[PDB]
Amino acid sequence: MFDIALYEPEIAPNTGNIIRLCANCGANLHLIEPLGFDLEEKKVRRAGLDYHDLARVTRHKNYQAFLDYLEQRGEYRIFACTTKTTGHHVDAQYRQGDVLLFGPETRGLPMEVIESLPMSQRIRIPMMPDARSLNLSNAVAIIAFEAWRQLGFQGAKGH
Amino acid sequence: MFDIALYEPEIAPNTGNIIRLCANCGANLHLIEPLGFDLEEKKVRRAGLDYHDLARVTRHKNYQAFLDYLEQRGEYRIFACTTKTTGHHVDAQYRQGDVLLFGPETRGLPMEVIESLPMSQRIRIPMMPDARSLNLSNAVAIIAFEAWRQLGFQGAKGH
């Protein structure tokens, strides 16, 4: 129903956490190369997963490959998840086909990518005043579960 | 505000993640001993933390020490994150003074602790069927940011 996309993810445990999370809320996961890690079976199993958990995972050679993929697939909206905007994750009206795009742990999303999208499709999780940024998988968790809430948790156990 | 409490946390990176998270949303963090790890200065620095992040952290000898601390301080409600209930994190009405209680990664909260609280104060995060459990930090993030949302993000940058 909606997808999650990591731009050049750097830290493996984060991507592990985000794979569990996508299974939990039923999102597909997009990893835009280059990655700071391999999905080697031995590291994947050490973190309590296996090859079947990596079915929702699609790799792309670069950002433009990722855009070409979405166009040739169906209707979509990209949301740029960044500290560098004024609009909250709760003020966006989410819908089937949306893509939540997240920046790398260190540099964050490139200015060009964020600027390619209108204000309405840029979203910041509120933070205490003396705070620089959330851990990547925490940001994905928060924004993913706000989108899912707005979609009435379509497809959840007992719901 | 509201607080977060970890019952016998076992895995260090999770608790590191959760200390950053408490600073980011301005919650106090309660660690109920025994822990599965030491908080040695060299591991704390390796995980990108300092004195200021560790001021938010209060340790308790056991569950009852944690309860004694809370009643010596004012009104409070404990909310337990558990799979053993029907109520979603969204369906609870959170309020200033509430405490979000989380079980150890490898064990979950003791039956007795969950049973000590009424149905309304037991909460589960929605899950798609037959999905691996969330990383503990992500579960804390989801429930913490729902409580914060209901409190209109009191105290966030520019509020």
Ligand SMILES: Nc1ncnc2c1ncn2[C@@H]1O[C@H](CSCC[C@H](N)C(=O)O)[C@@H](O)[C@H]1O
């Ligand atoms: N408050 C917030 N709102 C929205 N997304 C956030 C966020 N905090 C982190 N993220 C997401 O998590 C990614 C990794 S954090 C990167 C920021 C970097 N440490 C810096 O100095 O700026 C971000 O690019 C963004 O997509």
